[PDB]
Write a protein that binds this ligand. Structure first.
Ligand SMILES: [Cl-]
Ligand SMILES: [Cl-]
Ligand SMILES: [Cl-]
Length: 101
């Protein structure tokens, strides 16, 4: 609910994986959550979103609005660091921490 920027990021990430979002829409939207997290002092949430934004940006470099290529979705979602960051943002502890702030 209110102030749950981690949860909001996970919703964006789910849309990214479904092909629903394009580039740079996905990173601009994640950056928005990341700024919300920064303003609220959800420091770990900010950092997790930042790591994901970097991964997506980097994977899009060879492809420099547009839909995300299937190859990029596959590469990113297969990256263990991405999986860890998304799970962290999705985790109860993180979401509660965000709501409590
Ligand atoms: Cl946090
Ligand atoms: Cl912070
Ligand atoms: Cl990747």
């Amino acid at each position: 609910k209110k102030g749950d920027y981690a949860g909001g990021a996970v919703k964006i990430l789910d849309m990214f994986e479904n092909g629903q979002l394009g580039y740079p829409e996905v990173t601009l939207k994640l950056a928005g959550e990341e700024a919300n997290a920064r303003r609220a002092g959800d420091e770990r949430t900010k950092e997790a979103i930042h790591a994901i934004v970097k991964m997506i940006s980097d994977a899009m470099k060879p492809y420099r609005s547009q839909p995300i290529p299937g190859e990029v979705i596959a590469q990113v979602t297969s990256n263990p660091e991405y999986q860890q960051a998304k799970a962290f943002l999705a985790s109860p502890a993180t979401q509660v921490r965000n709501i409590e702030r």
